[PDB]
UniProtKB/Swiss-Prot annotation:
The keyword Nuclease does not apply. One of its GO terms (biological process) is visual perception. GO terms for cellular component: cilium; cytoplasm; cytoplasmic vesicle; cytoplasmic vesicle membrane; cytoskeleton; cytosol; intracellular membrane-bounded organelle. It comes from Homo sapiens (Human). This is Retinal rod rhodopsin-sensitive cGMP 3',5'-cyclic phosphodiesterase subunit delta. Transmembrane segments: none annotated. Interacts with the prenylated catalytic subunits of PDE6, an oligomer composed of two catalytic chains (PDE6A and PDE6B) and two inhibitory chains (gamma); has no effect on enzyme activity but promotes the release of the prenylated enzyme from cell membrane. Interacts with prenylated GRK1 and GRK7. Interacts with prenylated Ras family members, including RAP2A and RAP2C. Interacts with prenylated RHEB and NRAS. Interacts with prenylated HRAS and KRAS. Interacts with RAB13 (prenylated form); dissociates RAB13 from membranes. Interacts with prenylated INPP5E. GO terms for molecular function: GTPase inhibitor activity; small GTPase binding. It is a peripheral membrane protein. Belongs to the PDE6D/unc-119 family. The keyword Cytoplasm applies. Keywords: Cell projection, cGMP, Ciliopathy, Cytoplasm, Cytoplasmic vesicle, Cytoskeleton, Joubert syndrome, Membrane, Sensory transduction, Vision.
Length: 149
């Protein structure tokens, strides 16, 4: 379909350039990287400080480029622990100018009344599954395994 083709065109023109995570309360940088963790078809890995689990809220900056125009660029993310979804997050960027580079800031807030498992239990057992969309059009699905260090 035309939609299938457009999804592949968007992915072809997309790159995640850099990303970081901060403690939202204190502003302290917890993690940064310049690897495109959204590339599909390989299992990515990331090592995050275990103190992230004690943060009430984490702020993320995600810098991306896109050759293609999008009307409603958005993400869905699922936190999987040993194959079970523990949390689902939704974030919207909106309109993307063709051939633009953009920094997208999002807030990841603790769900009540969730409590974090110990880092030692979680480490290597958490997969983040991320789906990019333009509106209802699925552009890519990618996975990252987390280690708490
Ligand atoms: C019961 N729920 C539960 N249990 C364990 C872990 C978490 C998820 N954690 C975040 C919260 C923060 C608020 N309260 C404490 C935990 S997390 O620290 O493991 C986490 C997970 C994913 C992300 S992410 O989606 O921003 N991101 C994954 C990611 C981001 C963007 C894209 Cl395109 C792809 C992957 C990466 C983390 C390492 C590199 C960046 C941030 C933080 N949730």
């Amino acid at each position: 379909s035309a939609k299938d083709e457009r999804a592949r065109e968007i992915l072809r023109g997309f790159k995640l350039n850099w990303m970081n995570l901060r403690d939202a309360e204190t502003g302290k940088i917890l993690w940064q990287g310049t690897e495109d963790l959204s590339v599909p078809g390989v299992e990515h890995e990331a090592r995050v400080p275990k103190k992230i689990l004690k943060c009430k809220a984490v702020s993320r900056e995600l810098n991306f480029s896109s050759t293609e125009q999008m009307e409603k660029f958005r993400l869905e993310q699922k936190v999987y622990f040993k194959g079970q979804c523990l949390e689902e997050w939704f974030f919207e960027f909106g309109f993307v100018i063709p051939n633009s580079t953009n920094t997208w800031q999002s807030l990841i807030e603790a769900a009540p009344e969730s409590q974090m498992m110990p880092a030692s239990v979680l480490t290597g057992n958490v997969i983040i599954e991320t789906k990019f969309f333009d509106d209802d059009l699925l552009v890519s699905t990618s996975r990252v395994r987390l280690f708490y260090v």
